[PDB]
């Protein structure tokens, strides 16, 4: 079995170029926007973040945190003991874990 | 059995053995070696094997069987049929019996259910 | 078990008392190749 | 004497142990490899001091230079140059690779030696994650195509986008349109 | 901000202690005159480890030590066979390029490790538990097919056979268990109201004697008139067991070509 | 040969010797295969903890930041500090050279400008890297901390007394463990089956299809 | 790769032989309940079975449970914490199978080096190369470029 | 995203996997399942490229 | 001869005595073992490596002056000193500035001393063990912070394990063998005393606190 | 667990992997290194990595700790202990779980039923 | 005799043999047998040697 | 997995030989 063997699953076009093998293009390569839009594209959701969605996060945070432990009882264990006697489908619905 | 004119390269090349043969599409510059002269409309080279097959009947009308068709042109012609028509059946078969032999067939390498997982 | 399901079939205790004679097989690290020239 | 190994831990409670012995405050800035350095060198600062020797025939220091070579390649090994590494045993302790703990491959190709299969390959998982293709520098003076247009190339801001693996380099993969005039072996 | 130093330090006070292996007169008696003047001396090197400081291993003469690998009988030759056996020499000769090759791993022993599976393989099987802990099973389609689709294959082939495994342990272990919870023929109808206030002290030496004559002072006063008597005795009680002896059985391994059973070997040759 | 320091303490190895013939000996050994099928058994009925308790998850976001170890290139920076002493002295080896031989004088008016900028990227360097150490150390102290008043609870789970309990059953178990007999068969532990009994009987349901149940928190080996 | 070469060098080997009170490779708590479990006690048999999950401990070297990722009672700075919390072992050996059941891979046995090498990065190294090229440009300058004679 | 979707062929030694015969002699006799031939490989984010 | 010559003669003038006096014309083999270890004037003590030096410094030093040597490229602008028609004036200032860049010749030489080497991956390699790995081993790795943090963490929660282990085996130390069996005890389970026995209550085996 | 003194080596040497360590038996050459004198029977020696740590006793009763224990004979023994016994912890565990791996085992290459053969 | 009864291990590449997967999907669910451990190898008449 | 390897079912006995290996 040829050693440098690779089985691809997105189509690569190869360059067919003397003395050179390599990828030369992508079918179908669209050019997203360049690194300074998006740079301002997250700016704009940063500056909001850090204007209005500061207030009440403290206790976001810690649901967060308690939702990020192994077992479901040590989660309720958390709740109830750091976020204030919390539920854990009210506090799920929050975080937006539930469908 | 191959219902067109093109199949994908990686289709019949082997996902877990070594690949020494290839299934070319026909040779077309082997028609431009026939010094006479000659009918052959596009619509034929593509299907496999095929193109080889009217090129020895050509020769075969043109010259015989005898002193005269024993030139390299038309040999090489016979021969290329013989031997696609030969691979072309054993690819067949394994296609239809050893599927997961070649890339692109989901059993050469079988993708699990999720319950067998364990989650 | 413990809020987790772990899905295995119907075990069968009676495999654990399976009378199994060992038999003899040796490795032999140096022995015959193929060919030979 | 199994006890005494446990003497300086009698007069102290477990908080004092963990706190003496175990959390160590962090200081990554001493050359701790200066005693390696001191060790070693020292044998070129020998030298120095012994081939100025006052004997008087050329042959007897010969033999004084052949003992002090033997005491070197003890640890050498090999006289000859880019023929091999010498050898040296070091204590084992918390700070060893302590700048590289942060690396994977470097853990396996240190700890692990791995039994060959009948299926003789390299792990597949491992051959998986060697083809996610690390960064390479574009500044090139070797490839004389570049060597002219980098002159003429304007570097502008990579703003950060959140990730730790912004290709603004190029890829160390031998297929990279980029990378190709590159000889991977 | 002063350095800290290992347990090490507080077993020796000192970070120059010259530990030498070699049990020679000119190798010890110059440890304990370097060990003595390691205070003062510019030719000082440690043996014992700091956070500020690396240090040097045993030293062995001039060069250093490092124990005789554990014997391993797996070697490789080159021009003839040499038969190797680890147990013949007490120190393993070096290996000639023309004669032997050694087992990799001089200090080495055997474990079992487990690749890292992709973070992103990961991040899916948290938001499954997640989700499944939170709306349940039946309503985590979509994070299943992430799993399957953005875990690679390989990662796959290995949570299958994780399960395959531990069900395979899960057996080996509940096999154990009904072996362990057997109650044989010499404890049937025997409960925990049966059992003796005794410890572990009450089976040793001391209150249980041992299967040997000369443990203690029970034979210490036989005569060889006592051992006459006594070996009347056991032949007459070999007078009423000798009647019974086990018939031979048909030899299993009698045909040589054949694969033979690994029955218990006799006690003696 | 798992289970050593078990087995050789049961044959009597730490207070006795074994027979000095072999048929005896052989059935000493074959003695303890139900203590071994019994003990291994018991090892395996410890109840789980939280493993968020003396380690952190390493799958949590927040550690993917895949941050380096900043390190000082001492020998790297000693090294340039030597060949700068070595530009030193190669001038002053040639002073009289480089200070009256008109020829020179441009190694005379700039030598001192090459050595003062290979001084500063030595310098810039050295500085920069005790810089980033700092902020490095004092960063994994400060967050440390803050996980730990975090996770501080899970030490007051019930959990943790009941891994507590289980540990000491065990204890307390084994020491009423004993030797019965030393005629070198099974029945010389046979009230200590009871006694083991019983402890996996208070962990488990044996009349059940896997009196041993798969949880991923469990034992196995 | 093709990168700069020294003509001399010096590999170190941090050798865990564990025969050493001299450094931190010494199992403190192995050779203490050993010694611990030759007195004649009532818990000799308990101290046994001690020994042995400490062992089957070992031999789980997972990312987990290692001394790389200095991991609690695995690692040479905790190896103290064993002499007064042995009961950990169990939670151990549950918490590597909670990681590598759902974010681990197969279980496989690999060989586990003892022997921990590392290049000495060294100043005076260096210097013995410079010299070594000094040798060989002068040898240059002295078979092609000396018109003293 | 091509090299993270660039797997190789064969996987890894099955005869180092745990063996179907030897569960049915152990208790457990394992089900058959079929190849999933619906789902799609995809690379995910960027940020776990 | 030279000073550390001198200095190694003080410091053997008493060893240059036995040899030369007493060994070297004693008799026999003690007459040509001292002979041959004699002490004086070094016979080819010269330093090829000094003087491999001295040579070498010579030489490009003849060269830095005829480099460093040349006409202004400003004083040939004005056409008033010396020079009119100059059409290679901008090259006057290349042989001194190659010149001067020489005295970072060996500051930078190699790799590693013209930037941060661990951040690249020769350094890798020499921290494995001069060994090959694959050329993505500079992104694999597992954050430092959880290595740093983590160790410190497991550390700050033992402390508190201990006082709560304390004060569990205290309150099961005054608890009845009926309930240290039955709490936490598998509902299944029928609770059947056992004889009482001595066993003592012993915190820690080895006598540490 | 090992339930003897002695031990097939074939038992303990994989089938479909790389043999590069074996199990042998105690070094019995090691125990004439002491030079102490010092009483060992002939019961004790077989049973595994038990020899090594009667050595080191010996060795730690004749010697202690410190500056005394560190002499190549006594060092060699309790690395051999430490080694013994790790080695064979988990080759203990893999003949308990993977049975499979090992030399003489009746799964390392399964003989089929005559209900697979179709006769 | 020897060498008839001379095997060598891991015999061949079972993903050059069919596979339960596919034959799941083709309509017939194979049936999982257990090892023959009861079988003892040996040779045949010298006559066959 | 080492070339040189075989799986034998029935015992053989190796000379203890010098520079020779056989049964
Ligand atoms: C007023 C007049 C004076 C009156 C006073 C007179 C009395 C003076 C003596 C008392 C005061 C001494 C002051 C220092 C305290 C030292 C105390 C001590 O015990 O040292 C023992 C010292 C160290 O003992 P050690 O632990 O065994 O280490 C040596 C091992 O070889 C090491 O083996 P290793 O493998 O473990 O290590 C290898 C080693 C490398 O070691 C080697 O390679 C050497 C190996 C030996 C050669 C190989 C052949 C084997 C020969 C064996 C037979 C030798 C027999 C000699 C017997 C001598 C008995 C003393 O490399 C290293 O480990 C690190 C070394 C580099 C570290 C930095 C060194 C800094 C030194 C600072 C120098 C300052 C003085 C200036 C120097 C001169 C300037 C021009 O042993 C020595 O005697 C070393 C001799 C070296 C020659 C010195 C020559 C210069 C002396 C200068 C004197 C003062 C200036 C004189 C000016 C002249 C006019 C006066
Ligand atoms: C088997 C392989 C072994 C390999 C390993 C061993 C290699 C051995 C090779 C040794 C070659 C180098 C020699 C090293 C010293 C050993 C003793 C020796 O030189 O041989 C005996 C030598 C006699 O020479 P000879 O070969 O027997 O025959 C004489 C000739 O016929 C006629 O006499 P001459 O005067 O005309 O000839 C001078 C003679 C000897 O001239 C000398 O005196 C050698 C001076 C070497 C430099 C020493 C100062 C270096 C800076 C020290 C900085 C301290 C930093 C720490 C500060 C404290 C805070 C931590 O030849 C040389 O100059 C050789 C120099 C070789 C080039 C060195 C510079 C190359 C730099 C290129 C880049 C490389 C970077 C690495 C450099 C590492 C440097 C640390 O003894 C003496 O010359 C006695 C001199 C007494 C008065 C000296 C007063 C102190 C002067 C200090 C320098 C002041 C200038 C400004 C420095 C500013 C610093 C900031
Ligand atoms: C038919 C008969 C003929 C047959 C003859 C026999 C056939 C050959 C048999 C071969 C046998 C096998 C060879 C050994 C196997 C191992 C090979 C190996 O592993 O090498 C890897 C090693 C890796 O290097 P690489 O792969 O070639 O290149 C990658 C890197 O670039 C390398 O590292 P890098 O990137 O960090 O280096 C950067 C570069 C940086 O360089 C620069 O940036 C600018 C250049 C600065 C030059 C400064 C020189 C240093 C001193 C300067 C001080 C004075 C300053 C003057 C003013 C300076 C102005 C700025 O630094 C240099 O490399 C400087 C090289 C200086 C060489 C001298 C310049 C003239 C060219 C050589 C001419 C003579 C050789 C031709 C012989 C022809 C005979 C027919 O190869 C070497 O480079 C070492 C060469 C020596 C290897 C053979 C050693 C054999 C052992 C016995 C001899 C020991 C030497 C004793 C000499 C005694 C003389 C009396
Ligand atoms: C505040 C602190 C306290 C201060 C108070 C105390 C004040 C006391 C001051 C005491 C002494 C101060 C020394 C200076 C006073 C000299 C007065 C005098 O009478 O001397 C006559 C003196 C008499 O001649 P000499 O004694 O026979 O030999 C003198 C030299 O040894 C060799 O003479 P040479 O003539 O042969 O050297 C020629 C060399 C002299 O070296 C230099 O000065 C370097 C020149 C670099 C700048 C070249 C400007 C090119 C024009 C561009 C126009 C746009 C400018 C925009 C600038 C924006 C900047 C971002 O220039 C060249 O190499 C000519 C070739 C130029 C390259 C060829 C290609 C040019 C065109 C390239 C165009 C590329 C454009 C592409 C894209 C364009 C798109 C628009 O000649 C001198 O000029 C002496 C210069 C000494 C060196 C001074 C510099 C030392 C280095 C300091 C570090 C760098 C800091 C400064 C950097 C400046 C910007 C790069
Ligand atoms: C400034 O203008 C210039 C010149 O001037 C005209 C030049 O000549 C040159 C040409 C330069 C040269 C010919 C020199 C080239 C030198 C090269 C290539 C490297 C030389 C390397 C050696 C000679 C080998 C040295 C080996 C070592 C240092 C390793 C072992 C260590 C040793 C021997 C020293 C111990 C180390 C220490 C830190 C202790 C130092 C000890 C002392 C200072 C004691 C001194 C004692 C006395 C008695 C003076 C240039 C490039 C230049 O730019
Ligand atoms: C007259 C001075 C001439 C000096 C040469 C001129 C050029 C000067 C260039 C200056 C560059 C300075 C940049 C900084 C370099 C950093 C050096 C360094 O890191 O050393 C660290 C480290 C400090 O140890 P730690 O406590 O572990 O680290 C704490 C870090 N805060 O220093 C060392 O490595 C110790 C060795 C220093 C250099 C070698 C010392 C010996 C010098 C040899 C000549 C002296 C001969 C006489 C010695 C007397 C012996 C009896």
């Given at each position: 079995?040829?050693?440098?063997?690779?089985?691809?699953?997105?189509?690569?076009?190869?360059?067919?170029?003397?003395?050179?093998?390599?990828?030369?293009?992508?079918?179908?390569?669209?050019?997203?926007?360049?690194?300074?839009?998006?740079?301002?594209?997250?700016?704009?959701?940063?500056?909001?973040?850090?204007?209005?969605?500061?207030?009440?996060?403290?206790?976001?945070?810690?649901?967060?945190?308690?939702?990020?432990?192994?077992?479901?009882?040590?989660?309720?264990?958390?709740?109830?003991?750091?976020?204030?006697?919390?539920?854990?489908?009210?506090?799920?619905?929050?975080?937006?874990?539930?469908? | 059995?191959?219902?067109?004119?093109?199949?994908?390269?990686?289709?019949?090349?082997?996902?877990?053995?070594?690949?020494?043969?290839?299934?070319?599409?026909?040779?077309?510059?082997?028609?431009?070696?026939?010094?006479?002269?000659?009918?052959?409309?596009?619509?034929?080279?593509?299907?496999?094997?095929?193109?080889?097959?009217?090129?020895?009947?050509?020769?075969?009308?043109?010259?015989?069987?005898?002193?005269?068709?024993?030139?390299?042109?038309?040999?090489?012609?016979?021969?290329?049929?013989?031997?696609?028509?030969?691979?072309?059946?054993?690819?067949?078969?394994?296609?239809?019996?050893?599927?997961?032999?070649?890339?692109?067939?989901?059993?050469?390498?079988?993708?699990?259910?999720?319950?067998?997982?364990?989650? | 078990?413990?809020?987790?399901?772990?899905?295995?079939?119907?075990?069968?205790?009676?495999?654990?008392?399976?009378?199994?004679?060992?038999?003899?097989?040796?490795?032999?690290?140096?022995?015959?190749?193929?060919?030979?020239? | 004497?199994?006890?005494?190994?446990?003497?300086?831990?009698?007069?102290?409670?477990?908080?004092?142990?963990?706190?003496?012995?175990?959390?160590?405050?962090?200081?990554?800035?001493?050359?701790?490899?200066?005693t390696?350095?001191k060790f070693?060198?020292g044998?070129?600062l020998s030298?120095?001091?012994?081939?100025?020797?006052?004997?008087?025939?050329?042959?007897?220091?010969?033999?004084?230079?052949?003992?002090?070579?033997?005491?070197?390649?003890?640890?050498?090994?090999?006289?000859?140059?880019?023929?091999?590494?010498?050898?040296?045993?070091?204590?084992?302790?918390?700070?060893?690779?302590?700048?590289?703990?942060?690396?994977?491959?470097?853990?396996?190709?240190?700890?692990?030696?791995?039994?060959?299969?009948?299926?003789?390959?390299?792990?597949?998982?491992?051959?998986?994650?060697?083809?996610?293709?690390?960064?390479?520098?574009?500044?090139?003076?070797?490839?004389?195509?570049?060597?002219?247009?980098?002159?003429?190339?304007?570097?502008?801001?990579?703003?950060?986008?959140?990730?730790?693996?912004?290709?603004?380099?190029?890829?160390?993969?031998?297929?990279?349109?980029?990378?190709?005039?590159?000889?991977?072996? | 901000?002063?350095?800290?130093?290992?347990?090490?330090?507080?077993?020796?006070?000192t970070h120059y202690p010259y530990?030498?292996?070699?049990?020679?007169?000119?190798?010890?008696?110059l440890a304990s005159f370097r060990r003595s003047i390691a205070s003062i001396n510019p030719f000082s090197y440690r043996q014992?480890?700091?956070?500020?400081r690396?240090?040097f291993?045993?030293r062995?003469?001039?060069?250093?030590?490092?124990?005789?690998?554990?014997?391993?009988?797996?070697?490789?030759?080159?021009?003839?066979?040499?038969?190797?056996?680890?147990?013949?020499?007490?120190?393993?000769?070096?290996?000639?390029?023309?004669?032997?090759?050694?087992?990799?791993?001089?200090?080495?022993?055997?474990?079992?490790?487990?690749?890292?599976?992709?973070?992103?393989?990961?991040?899916?099987?948290?938001?499954?538990?997640?989700?499944?802990?939170?709306?349940?099973?039946?309503?985590?389609?979509?994070?299943?097919?992430?799993?399957?689709?953005?875990?690679?294959?390989?990662?796959?082939?290995?949570?299958?056979?994780?399960?395959?495994?531990?069900?395979?342990?899960?057996?080996?272990?509940?096999?154990?268990?009904?072996?362990?919870?057997?109650?044989?023929?010499?404890?049937?109808?025997?409960?925990?109201?049966?059992?003796?206030?005794?410890?572990?002290?009450?089976?040793?030496?001391?209150?249980?004697?041992?299967?040997?004559?000369?443990?203690?002072?029970?034979?210490?006063?036989?005569?060889?008139?006592?051992?006459?008597?006594?070996?009347?005795?056991?032949?007459?009680?070999?007078?009423?067991?000798?009647?019974?002896?086990?018939?031979?059985?048909?030899?299993?391994?009698?045909?040589?070509?054949?694969?033979?059973?690994?029955?218990?070997?006799?006690?003696?040759? | 040969?798992?289970?050593?320091?078990?087995?050789?303490?049961?044959?009597?190895?730490?207070?006795?010797?074994?027979?000095?013939?072999?048929?005896?000996?052989?059935?000493?050994?074959?003695?303890?295969?139900?203590?071994?099928?019994?003990?291994?058994?018991?090892?395996?009925?410890?109840?789980?903890?939280?493993?968020?308790?003396?380690?952190?998850?390493?799958?949590?976001?927040?550690?993917?930041?895949?941050?380096?170890?900043?390190?000082?290139?001492?020998?790297?920076?000693?090294?340039?500090?030597?060949?700068?002493?070595?530009?030193?002295?190669?001038?002053?080896?040639?002073?009289?050279?480089?200070?009256?031989?008109?020829?020179?004088?441009?190694?005379?008016?700039?030598?001192?400008?090459?050595?003062?900028?290979?001084?500063?990227?030595?310098?810039?360097?050295?500085?920069?890297?005790?810089?980033?150490?700092?902020?490095?150390?004092?960063?994994?102290?400060?967050?440390?901390?803050?996980?730990?008043?975090?996770?501080?609870?899970?030490?007051?789970?019930?959990?943790?007394?009941?891994?507590?309990?289980?540990?000491?059953?065990?204890?307390?178990?084994?020491?009423?463990?004993?030797?019965?007999?030393?005629?070198?068969?099974?029945?010389?532990?046979?009230?200590?089956?009871?006694?083991?009994?019983?402890?996996?009987?208070?962990?488990?349901?044996?009349?059940?299809?896997?009196?041993?149940?798969?949880?991923?928190?469990?034992?196995?080996? | 790769?093709?990168?700069?070469?020294?003509?001399?060098?010096?590999?170190?080997?941090?050798?865990?032989?564990?025969?050493?009170?001299?450094?931190?490779?010494?199992?403190?708590?192995?050779?203490?309940?050993?010694?611990?479990?030759?007195?004649?006690?009532?818990?000799?048999?308990?101290?046994?079975?001690?020994?042995?999950?400490?062992?089957?401990?070992?031999?789980?070297?997972?990312?987990?449970?290692?001394?790389?990722?200095?991991?609690?009672?695995?690692?040479?700075?905790?190896?103290?914490?064993?002499?007064?919390?042995?009961?950990?072992?169990?939670?151990?050996?549950?918490?590597?199978?909670?990681?590598?059941?759902?974010?681990?891979?197969?279980?496989?046995?690999?060989?586990?080096?003892?022997?921990?090498?590392?290049?000495?990065?060294?100043?005076?190294?260096?210097?013995?190369?410079?010299?070594?090229?000094?040798?060989?440009?002068?040898?240059?300058?002295?078979?092609?470029?000396?018109?003293?004679? | 995203?091509?090299?993270?979707?660039?797997?190789?062929?064969?996987?890894?030694?099955?005869?180092?996997?745990?063996?179907?015969?030897?569960?049915?002699?152990?208790?457990?006799?394992?089900?058959?399942?079929?190849?999933?031939?619906?789902?799609?490989?995809?690379?995910?984010?960027?940020?776990?490229? | 001869?030279?000073?550390?010559?001198?200095?190694?003669?003080?410091?053997?003038?008493?060893?240059?005595?036995?040899?030369?006096?007493?060994?070297?014309?004693?008799?026999?083999?003690?007459?040509?073992?001292?002979?041959?270890?004699?002490?004086?004037?070094?016979?080819?003590?010269?330093?090829?490596?000094?003087?491999?030096?001295?040579?070498?410094?010579?030489?490009?030093?003849?060269?830095?002056?005829?480099?460093?040597?040349?006409?202004?490229?400003?004083?040939?602008?004005?056409?008033?000193?010396?020079?009119?028609?100059?059409?290679?004036?901008?090259?006057?200032?290349?042989?001194?500035?190659?010149?001067?860049?020489?005295?970072?010749?060996?500051?930078?030489?190699?790799?590693?001393?013209?930037?941060?080497?661990?951040?690249?991956?020769?350094?890798?390699?020499?921290?494995?063990?001069?060994?090959?790995?694959?050329?993505?081993?500079?992104?694999?790795?597992?954050?430092?912070?959880?290595?740093?943090?983590?160790?410190?963490?497991?550390?700050?929660?033992?402390?508190?394990?201990?006082?709560?282990?304390?004060?569990?085996?205290?309150?099961?130390?005054?608890?009845?063998?009926?309930?240290?069996?039955?709490?936490?005890?598998?509902?299944?389970?029928?609770?059947?005393?056992?004889?009482?026995?001595?066993?003592?209550?012993?915190?820690?085996?080895?006598?540490?606190?």
């Open positions: 079995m040829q050693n440098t063997t690779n089985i691809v699953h997105v189509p690569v076009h190869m360059g067919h170029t003397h003395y050179f093998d390599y990828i030369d293009s992508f079918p179908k390569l669209k050019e997203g926007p360049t690194l300074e839009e998006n740079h301002i594209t997250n700016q704009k959701i940063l500056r909001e973040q850090l204007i209005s969605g500061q207030q009440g996060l403290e206790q976001n945070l810690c649901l967060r945190n308690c939702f990020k432990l192994s077992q479901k009882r040590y989660i309720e264990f958390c709740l109830d003991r750091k976020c204030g006697g919390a539920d854990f489908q009210r506090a799920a619905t929050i975080l937006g874990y539930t469908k | 059995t191959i219902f067109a004119e093109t199949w994908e390269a990686s289709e019949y090349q082997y996902r877990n053995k070594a690949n020494l043969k290839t299934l070319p599409v026909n040779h077309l510059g082997k028609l431009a070696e026939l010094k006479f002269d000659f009918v052959e409309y596009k619509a034929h080279q593509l299907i496999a094997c095929h193109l080889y097959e009217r090129m020895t009947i050509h020769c075969m009308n043109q010259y015989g069987l005898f002193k005269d068709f024993y030139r390299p042109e038309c040999l090489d012609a016979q021969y290329y049929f013989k031997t696609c028509v030969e691979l072309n059946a054993a690819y067949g078969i394994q296609k239809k019996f050893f599927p997961e032999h070649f890339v692109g067939s989901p059993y050469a390498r079988p993708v699990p259910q999720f319950q067998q997982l364990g989650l | 078990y413990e809020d987790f399901v772990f899905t295995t079939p119907y075990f069968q205790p009676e495999s654990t008392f399976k009378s199994v004679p060992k038999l003899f097989s040796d490795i032999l690290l140096g022995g015959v190749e193929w060919v030979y020239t | 004497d199994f006890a005494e190994l446990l003497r300086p831990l009698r007069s102290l409670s477990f908080n004092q142990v963990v706190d003496r012995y175990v959390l160590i405050p962090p200081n990554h800035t001493f050359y701790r490899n200066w390696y350095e070693l060198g044998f070129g030298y120095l001091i012994l081939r100025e020797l006052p004997l008087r025939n050329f042959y007897a220091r010969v033999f004084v230079m052949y003992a002090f070579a033997a005491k070197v390649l003890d640890h050498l090994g090999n006289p000859f140059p880019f023929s091999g590494h010498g050898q040296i045993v070091a204590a084992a302790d918390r700070w060893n690779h302590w700048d590289v703990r942060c690396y994977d491959n470097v853990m396996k190709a240190l700890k692990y030696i791995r039994i060959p299969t009948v299926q003789n390959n390299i792990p597949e998982a491992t051959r998986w994650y060697g083809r996610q293709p690390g960064h390479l520098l574009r500044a090139d003076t070797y490839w004389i195509p570049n060597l002219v247009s980098q002159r003429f190339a304007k570097h502008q801001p990579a703003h950060w986008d959140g990730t730790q693996n912004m290709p603004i380099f190029r890829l160390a993969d031998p297929k990279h349109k980029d990378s190709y005039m590159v000889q991977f072996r | 901000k002063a350095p800290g130093q290992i347990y090490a330090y507080d077993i020796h006070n530990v030498n292996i070699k049990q020679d007169s000119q190798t010890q008696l014992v480890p700091s956070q500020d690396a240090a291993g045993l062995w003469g001039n060069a250093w030590y490092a124990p005789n690998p554990y014997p391993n009988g797996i070697h490789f030759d080159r021009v003839f066979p040499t038969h190797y056996d680890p147990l013949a020499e007490t120190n393993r000769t070096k290996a000639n390029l023309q004669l032997i090759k050694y087992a990799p791993g001089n200090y080495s022993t055997l474990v079992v490790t487990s690749e890292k599976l992709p973070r992103p393989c990961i991040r899916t099987i948290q938001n499954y538990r997640r989700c499944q802990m939170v709306n349940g099973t039946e309503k985590c389609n979509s994070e299943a097919q992430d799993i399957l689709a953005i875990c690679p294959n390989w990662a796959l082939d290995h949570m299958k056979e994780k399960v395959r495994f531990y069900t395979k342990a899960l057996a080996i272990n509940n096999q154990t268990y009904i072996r362990a919870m057997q109650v044989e023929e010499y404890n049937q109808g025997r409960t925990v109201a049966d059992v003796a206030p005794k410890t572990w002290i009450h089976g040793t030496r001391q209150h249980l004697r041992p299967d040997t004559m000369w443990a203690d002072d029970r034979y210490t006063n036989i005569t060889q008139t006592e051992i006459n008597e006594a070996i009347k005795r056991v032949e007459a009680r070999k007078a009423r067991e000798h009647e019974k002896k086990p018939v031979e059985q048909a030899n299993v391994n009698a045909n040589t070509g054949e694969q033979p059973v690994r029955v218990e070997k006799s006690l003696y040759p | 040969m798992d289970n050593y320091f078990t087995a050789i303490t049961l044959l009597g190895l730490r207070d006795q010797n074994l027979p000095p013939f072999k048929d005896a000996r052989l059935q000493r050994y074959k003695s303890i295969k139900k203590m071994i099928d019994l003990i291994e058994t018991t090892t395996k009925l410890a109840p789980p903890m939280p493993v968020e308790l003396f380690m952190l998850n390493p799958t949590d976001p927040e550690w993917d930041d895949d941050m380096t170890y900043p390190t000082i290139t001492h020998a790297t920076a000693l090294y340039k500090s030597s060949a700068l002493a070595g530009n030193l002295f190669l001038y002053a080896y040639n002073y009289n050279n480089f200070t009256a031989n008109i020829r020179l004088r441009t190694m005379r008016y700039l030598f001192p400008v090459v050595s003062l900028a290979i001084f500063g990227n030595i310098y810039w360097d050295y500085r920069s890297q005790l810089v980033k150490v700092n902020l490095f150390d004092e960063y994994i102290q400060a967050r440390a901390q803050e996980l730990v008043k975090q996770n501080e609870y899970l030490l007051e789970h019930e959990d943790v007394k009941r891994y507590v309990w289980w540990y000491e059953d065990l204890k307390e178990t084994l020491a009423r463990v004993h030797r019965q007999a030393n005629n070198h068969k099974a029945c010389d532990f046979k009230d200590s089956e009871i006694i083991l009994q019983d402890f996996i009987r208070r962990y488990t349901n044996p009349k059940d299809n896997l009196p041993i149940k798969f949880h991923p928190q469990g034992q196995t080996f | 790769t093709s990168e700069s070469v020294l003509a001399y060098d010096y590999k170190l080997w941090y050798l865990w032989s564990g025969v050493s009170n001299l450094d931190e490779s010494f199992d403190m708590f192995f050779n203490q309940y050993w010694a611990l479990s030759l007195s004649t006690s009532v818990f000799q048999l308990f101290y046994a079975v001690i020994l042995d999950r400490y062992l089957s401990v070992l031999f789980q070297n997972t990312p987990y449970t290692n001394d790389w990722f200095r991991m609690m009672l695995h690692s040479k700075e905790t190896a103290l914490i064993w002499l007064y919390h042995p009961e950990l072992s169990w939670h151990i050996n549950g918490l590597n199978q909670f990681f590598t059941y759902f974010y681990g891979g197969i279980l496989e046995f690999v060989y586990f080096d003892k022997s921990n090498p590392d290049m000495c990065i060294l100043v005076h190294t260096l210097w013995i190369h410079l010299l070594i090229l000094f040798l060989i440009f002068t040898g240059f300058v002295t078979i092609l470029f000396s018109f003293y004679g | 995203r091509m090299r993270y979707l660039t797997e190789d062929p064969a996987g890894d030694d099955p005869l180092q996997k745990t063996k179907d015969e030897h569960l049915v002699d152990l208790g457990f006799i394992p089900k058959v399942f079929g190849a999933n031939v619906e789902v799609r490989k995809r690379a995910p984010h960027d940020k776990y490229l | 001869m030279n000073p550390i010559q001198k200095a190694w003669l003080k410091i053997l003038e008493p060893v240059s005595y036995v040899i030369n006096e007493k060994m070297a014309k004693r008799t026999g083999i003690i007459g040509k073992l001292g002979r041959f270890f004699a002490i004086g004037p070094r016979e080819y003590g010269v330093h090829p490596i000094n003087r491999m030096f001295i040579f070498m410094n010579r030489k490009y030093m003849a060269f830095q002056a005829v480099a460093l040597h040349r006409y202004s490229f400003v004083k040939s602008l004005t056409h008033n000193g010396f020079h009119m028609l100059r059409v290679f004036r901008h090259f006057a200032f290349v042989l001194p500035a190659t010149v001067l860049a020489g005295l970072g010749l060996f500051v930078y030489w190699g790799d590693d001393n013209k930037c941060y080497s661990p951040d690249r991956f020769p350094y890798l390699k020499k921290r494995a063990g001069d060994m090959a790995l694959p050329l993505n081993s500079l992104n694999q790795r597992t954050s430092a912070h959880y290595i740093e943090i983590n160790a410190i963490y497991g550390a700050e929660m033992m402390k508190r394990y201990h006082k709560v282990w304390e004060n569990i085996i205290e309150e099961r130390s005054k608890a009845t063998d009926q309930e240290k069996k039955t709490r936490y005890a598998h509902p299944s389970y029928q609770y059947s005393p056992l004889p009482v026995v001595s066993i003592p209550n012993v915190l820690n085996p080895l006598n540490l606190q």
